[PDB]
Subunit: 220 residues, 2 copies
Amino acid sequence: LDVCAVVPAAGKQYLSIGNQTILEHSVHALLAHPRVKRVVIAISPGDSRFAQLPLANHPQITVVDGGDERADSVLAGLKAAGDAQWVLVHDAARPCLHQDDLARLLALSETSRTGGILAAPVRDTMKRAEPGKNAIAHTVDRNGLWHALTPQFFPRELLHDCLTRALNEGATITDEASALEYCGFHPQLVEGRADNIKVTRPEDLALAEFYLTRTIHQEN
Amino acid sequence: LDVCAVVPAANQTILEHSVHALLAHPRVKRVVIAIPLANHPQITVVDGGDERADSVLAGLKAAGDAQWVLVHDAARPCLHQDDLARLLALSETSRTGGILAAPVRDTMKRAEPGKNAIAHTVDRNGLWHALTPQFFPRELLHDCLTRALNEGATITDEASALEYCGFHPQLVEGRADNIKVTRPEDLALAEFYLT
């Protein structure tokens, strides 16, 4: 049941919450589960900041050069995934990952042949804008609509082949699930907490910090 | 450009903070709460209905001579004054109005019917979280809300009533920390980090 994690970190991840970078909170969230034996971080050539983090001397961390696109970084991480049968792909900028959700995602390997992702149901109103304009086209129906979160958990070889194939066919890949979907698979949706935010807007840092503080508080 | 706001409240400190965030802007002279806060000279109370749309219409009958109306969620007390200002600016140029909104950050999936499995990816480009306030010309909001409701439209926010009748409100990019605070125990904390 060894698992290897891959973090596509090639470029917010170096912003800090408390006295750890967001990348470090994300990485340590992964290491909470004992089955996660290694974390491969894909970093961009020339990125010198990584080497300065204490995480850079962690015996369970592997560092490799990623590419310009997500799928390329992930493929680069997978070459260093050793003999792990299952791989976890997790966003560098998702520091609020909860151990309970990780644990429940990792159960997919006992029974799943495809794997699956953490996800959050859409529960508030969403709009689709007119193309080219900041005006509303229509309101989206939330029934069966999910936010794709990370981690995304898949058999190693299958992920590998689907991503290689999607890229080789010019497929339009965003997340890892999209590569499986393109090769005809239907990954499972594992409901996770909606506060597993990707820090992408400047105000998201304070939001992430609010969510971690509230959670620490609640646990008691 | 005097503005009347409507808050459908059909947890008292959360409503209170949301209300005073609206009242903070000079153009916002009054708030109508559709249902001690009620003893504020700037706060009006009316009967809210069973649906949000009906409470908002009920607020409209209390809005006086207001030419433009702000509709705000009672559970969004982390509204920032710069976002409110950029929204109110629509009255200078818009015939339709618009809403506060934030771009969606994640890849999006549509689940297979009947299963917790992905059918397909939904393109997140051009997809927005609809926030509040929602800001519209008085008569237009009134007329679209009334008509959509009588026609059995599925109304979510106010913009959706305009949508039903064929209008396309503007998307005004706001802060993504303008979150829903629904547990009272979270308010001080949300306010300390996001206010």
